[PDB]
């Protein structure tokens with residue numbers, strides 16, 4: 001009777017797709033007929049408490065409707081699993097290295113526009129994402145990407161400008177704006193900073209040796225353990241930023257630099273990025 005209800009007994013694990021820290025996503029076939037013709041779907045579950053977190057993520061995803069956000073399909077049930085559409089091309093981390101010859105600058109900018117549109121819609125629902133990275137963007141096709149994970153997404157209070165973070169143990173610090181690193185405050189403009197880092201990743205086709213962590217650990221030093229974040233904040237205070245990726249026109253690098261203004265309120269917005277990209281595309 002309910003198409004968003006997936007019975008556990010028919011949910012067959014095929015393989016792993018990716019891991020967060022407390023959750024993983026697996027490829028499954030939902031095969032109620034039993035002849036291996038059922039649909040393939042992506043299944044997020046917890047690692048053996050964060051049940052409430054997954055439930056909150058489910059309720060967020062369930063109510064987002066946008067062509068650049070991965071489709072909620074249903075739930076499999078204390079314990080619960082999130083069921084999403086499967087995108088065979090995987091994330092940008094998997095896809096870009098294998099399709100460099102296919103994806104030129106024009107196409108890269110189209111991806112960037114689509115990501116900005118997904119993030120802008122998200123911001124309009126009063127959510128901050130907090131995990132924007134090439135690894136969380138899924139490829140629907142050569143012509144379309146979708147933001148594909150919302151494990152850290154949080155609502156911002158009405159008449160408040162940020163969400164204050166409490167659990168930060170497993171933060172993606174090389175994607176984080178200073179206000180997040182120093183004060184654990186997350187503005188929509190912090191997602192913008194993160195978009196800047198994701199855009200850099202896009203422009204280097206997610207080559208691991210040009211990854212934001214790799215390049216940042218070159219600048220400051222790779223062997224500071226507990227002092228890494230402090231040295232990262234210093235670097236950003238001193239105005240050091242990631243360099244222009246190879247083959248990236250200056251005009252695109254300036255858009256990127258606007259995502260990286262030290263003060264949140266002086267950063268560009270997603271609507272402005274979209275305009276800047278659309279102007280370079282015409």
Ligand SMILES: O=c1[nH]ccc2c(NC3CCCCC3)ncnc12
Nearest residue numbers: 017018019020025042084085086087
């Ligand atoms: O096809 C997919 N659908 C949904 C999520 C997803 C995914 N999610 C990952 C993203 C990185 C964080 C862990 C979950 N990874 C690969 N494919 C898919």
